[PDB]
């Protein structure tokens, strides 16, 4: 999970909606609601800061070239689909596996879902063409068959393991991605964590609403 639903609550109308006689009595309780309304505001801003830090780690929005000659590596399921919201295939499944007049409003997030997908296109665009370098400085295009041979060099595996096994590893990685789709496609229990965040928040508000019925 990254961000909560940016809930916002109005103190007075939740408590004394459309009532002068009730709002006055609330005023004798001093700054209680100005505190509450402040705290939820503090949460609300932090949520956009959360999303800002998680995704917006890269300065320039990169784009992959039309050439997909990645030495056999097939990303087409994780790169954005130009033919749709420019979201990747695997992204869509994720969106699809996940699911009032009393002052309980929701503020929309600063970075919208289409906006996010641009970042996650860049981070993927820098990752495939440029390697790690686009984080430390100027993004340097690297042939992808090269880049693995650095990553294998990064876990104590000599370069020549990759190229002598380039074809197999490609198929394994390509096949690897596919099973993710089936795993994601088959079960909605894969996304329990994110679902849990929404359900708790839904319950919290749901509980919050019901208290209006109590004597």
């Amino acid at each position: 999970p990254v961000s909560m639903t940016k809930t916002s609550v109005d103190c007075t109308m939740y408590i004394c909606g459309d009532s002068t006689e009730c709002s006055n009595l609330l005023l004798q309780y001093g700054s209680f609601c100005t505190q509450l309304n402040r705290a939820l505001t503090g949460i609300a801003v932090e949520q956009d800061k959360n999303t800002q830090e998680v995704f917006a780690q890269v300065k320039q929005i990169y784009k992959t070239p039309p050439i997909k000659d990645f030495g056999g590596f097939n990303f087409s399921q994780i790169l954005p689909d130009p033919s749709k919201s420019k979201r990747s295939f695997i992204e869509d499944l994720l969106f699809n596996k996940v699911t009032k007049f009393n002052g309980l409003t929701v503020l929309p997030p600063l970075l919208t879902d289409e906006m996010i997908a641009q970042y996650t296109s860049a981070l993927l665009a820098g990752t495939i063409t440029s390697g790690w370098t686009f984080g430390a400085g100027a993004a340097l295009q690297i042939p992808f068959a090269m880049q693995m041979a650095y990553r294998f060099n990064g876990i104590g595996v000599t370069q020549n393991v990759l190229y002598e096994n380039q074809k197999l590893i490609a198929n394994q990685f390509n096949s690897a991605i596919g099973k993710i789709q089936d795993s994601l496609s088959s079960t909605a229990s894969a996304l329990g964590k994110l679902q849990d965040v929404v359900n708790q928040n839904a319950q919290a508000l749901n509980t919050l609403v019901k208290q209006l019925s109590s004597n």
Binding site: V2, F55, I116, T120, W132, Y150, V197
Partner: protein, 49 residues
């Protein structure tokens, strides 16, 4: 959530923008790379190990 975001922010920092050498930080095994994929109210990684 806030702590998870930083862990996420950390993960995409070391594990996407680089190749982390912290065992069991980018999934079981010797880490290679990872790709983020967006998600409603969260992020999803595909750690290639």
């Amino acid at each position: 959530i806030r702590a998870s975001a930083n862990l996420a922010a950390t993960k995409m920092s070391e594990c996407v923008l680089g190749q982390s050498k912290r065992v069991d930080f980018c999934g079981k095994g010797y880490h290679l790379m990872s790709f983020p994929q967006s998600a409603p109210h969260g992020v999803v990684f595909l750690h290639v190990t």
